[PDB]
Write a structure and sequence with these properties.
The structure is cut from a larger assembly and holds chains A (94 residues), B (116 residues), C (58 residues) and D (71 residues). Chain A has 94 residues and is α+β, with helices and mostly antiparallel strands. Helices cover 18% and strands 40% of the residues of chain A. The chains are: A alpha+beta (94), B alpha+beta (116), C alpha+beta (58), D mainly beta (71). The structure holds three RNA strands. The PDB classes it as ribosome.
RNA sequence: GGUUCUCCCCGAAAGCUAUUUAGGUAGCGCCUCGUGAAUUCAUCUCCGGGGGUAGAGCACUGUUUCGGCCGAUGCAAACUGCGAAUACCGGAGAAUGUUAUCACGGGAGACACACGGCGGGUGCUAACGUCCGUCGUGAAGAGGGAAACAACCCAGACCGCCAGCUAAGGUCCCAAAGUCAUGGUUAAGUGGGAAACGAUGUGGGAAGGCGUCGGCCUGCGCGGAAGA
RNA sequence: UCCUCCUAAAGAGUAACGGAGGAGCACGAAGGUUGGCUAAUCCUGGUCGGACAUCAGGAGGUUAGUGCAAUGGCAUAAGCC
RNA sequence: UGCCUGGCGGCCGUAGCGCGGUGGUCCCACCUGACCCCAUGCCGAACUCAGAAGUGAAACGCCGUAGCGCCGAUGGUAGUGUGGGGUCUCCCCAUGCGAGAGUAGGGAACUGCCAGGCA
């Protein structure tokens, strides 16, 4: 239902992760099924705004990158020990 | 726990012969049938195997499992080994007791002229 | 394969014995010295090891 | 309210240890002799013939074995 | 304590095992010259390695707590059902290194090292205190920068030229170079003295409140904050 | 004089009357070899025995032990008739 | 060449633990008695003598149960070699190597040789 915008990953590594965190972005992984996993990049502010609603854990997420519809569910999230910021999320396609 | 204990006790000679890496003659005893196998040091191939069940040697035997059958199996194993060229294989008792049919089979095999 | 130019930028006065051996293998004797070397995995590994003081004409 | 003993592996995998060389000297039995490897009274593993050394994992307990194979 | 002429090349250490020894005795480690010997040795790539260190976990040896020793939650130097980077041994490999590798002989030299960076012990997890494993400087390295200053940064001086470039550090003058720009902070000479408390000092940022009144975070100043 | 784990940064080694004790014995059998056997721990049944002076049906498989203070590996027991 | 059973090796939890069904054609299993080869630290407990006279009880081969248990990614996380910086007790920057656990996925294993019964 809701529209989500992300960017296709091009660089992989802890260096790329640190670059994204410095630039206010964070990586995410989507897997599930015989298809290979896809790594994407998402902005921190938009995901923080989205997480406010309690319907996030109950609604199936829709991702539109390069005009492709991907249906996923929030399998797991990573939270900093004390900083209220998001850094990574693992999703399973439904 | 009988078969497990038998396997464990036979494992002693099974591993002991491995270091010297010599062809081994093993015997499996059962009241119904008796089996004798020649196993190469690698342990994955058998040079020759005989069983009391086979008619070729059970025709002249009243019953498959007995002292006469063990002696016949020993003679057959000995002659096959002689015509194959085993070159004095070692032997293992497979955890059995060397007083009855096992001893009879060993004596029958040695009668042919083997030096094991 | 394609050859590349490797030039020294910083001295190895206070560098470790491994760094000194890497510089000796590269053949760079003085700061600013330039050499030509074929591109191979071993050369790439060495240049990554001592990348902080060597520039490459990729 | 002394002299430290020299432990550890002296020859590792791929070494062309010849006959009589001791592969490792450990306190107890960290590894068990396999093929062409002998064990001493003091729980020391030594080679019996020339060859290349290898370490393998086998058995229900997954016990480490030291073996020597023809080069 | 002294050891007197010049030039060329090479070029250490203040460490390791025993002492009715602690100032020394023997060898090993480090250096020089002569001879002999293998892609010998160093670097980097790939392959086979034991790791049990970091990280994690309570399955293994222990510990605090929770409902009334049973189960669980966290923790560990004489804890690992798991398990790094890194170091080290061997095999193969393009390339460089005046063989830089090893064997023998002659000659020695030294046998209270200091400081700093990296990870620890000790110490009251106060000390510019103490000892360790590794690397760098000095010892034996000139020169440039910080005010002098050796343990800080750059940089190994064959000689010479009234040549250019650059590393660290700087471009207001002393003293050679931007009184250069862009968007800001500071009102205190903070800069140019130092941590723990509080604050009607200020710019910015994410969230409150039925036009409205206030809370939290970040950068710079203030009383503690004192060197003859 | 000598051993036992750490500090000691996953080869060895690497400190300061460092943190810790033990041995300066013993078995001439506690040595070698062949056959077979191999738990500990806990519940349930016995005159008391309830687990704890002995026996058999189970939970569980190397938690008992291996002459020693301590230490590692040990069910192929490196134990025990 | 296909199904089933026993033995000899690799693999050593993708082979294990719990539950239901099936197996007497062959093979395997309970051994009755033993004064006879053999013997009990008492016991024919194990071993040795005769098989279908008695059956598949227990053990074991196979199917399912993914309930427990295991491995297992990409990704991230913690860490570290190298050069530098900071407010230097600790952290960050460019780069390389990269934790444990868990998620997707799997499996009730597979494979080489010999003997026997049914085809």
């Amino acid at each position: 239902m809701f529209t989500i915008n992300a960017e296709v990953r091009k660089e992989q590594g802890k260096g790329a992760s640190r670059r994204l965190r410095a630039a206010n972005k964070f990586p995410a992984i989507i897997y599930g099924g015989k298809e290979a996993p896809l790594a994407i990049e998402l902005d921190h502010d938009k995901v923080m705004n989205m997480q406010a609603k309690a319907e996030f854990y109950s609604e199936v997420l829709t991702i539109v990158v390069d005009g492709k519809e991907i249906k996923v569910k929030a399998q797991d999230v990573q939270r900093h020990p004390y900083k209220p910021k998001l850094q990574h999320i693992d999703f399973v396609r439904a | 726990d009988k078969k497990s204990a038998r396997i464990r006790r036979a494992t002693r000679a099974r591993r002991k012969l491995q270091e010297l890496g010599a062809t081994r003659l093993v015997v499996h005893r059962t009241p119904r049938h008796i089996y004798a196998q020649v196993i190469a040091p690698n342990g994955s191939e058998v040079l020759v195997a005989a069983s009391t069940v086979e008619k070729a040697i059970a025709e002249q035997l009243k019953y498959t499992g007995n002292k006469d059958a063990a002696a016949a199996v020993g003679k057959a194993v000995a002659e096959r080994a002689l015509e194959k060229g085993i070159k004095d294989v070692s032997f293992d008792r497979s955890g059995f007791q060397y007083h009855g049919r096992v001893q009879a089979l060993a004596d029958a095999a040695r009668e042919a002229g083997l030096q094991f | 394969a394609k050859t590349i130019k490797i030039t020294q930028t910083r001295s190895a006065i206070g560098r470790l014995p491994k760094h000194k051996a890497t510089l000796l293998g590269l053949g760079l004797r003085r700061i600013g010295h330039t050499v030509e070397r074929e591109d191979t995995p071993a050369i790439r590994g060495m240049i990554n090891a001592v990348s902080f003081m060597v520039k490459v004409e990729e | 309210t002394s002299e430290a003993k020299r432990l550890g592996v002296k020859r590792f995998g791929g070494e062309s240890v010849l006959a009589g060389s001791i592969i490792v000297r450990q306190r107890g039995t960290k590894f068990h002799a396999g093929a062409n490897v002998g064990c001493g009274r003091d729980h020391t593993l030594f080679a019996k013939a020339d060859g290349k050394v290898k370490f393998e994992v086998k058995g229900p307990k997954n016990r480490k074995f030291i073996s020597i194979e023809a080069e």
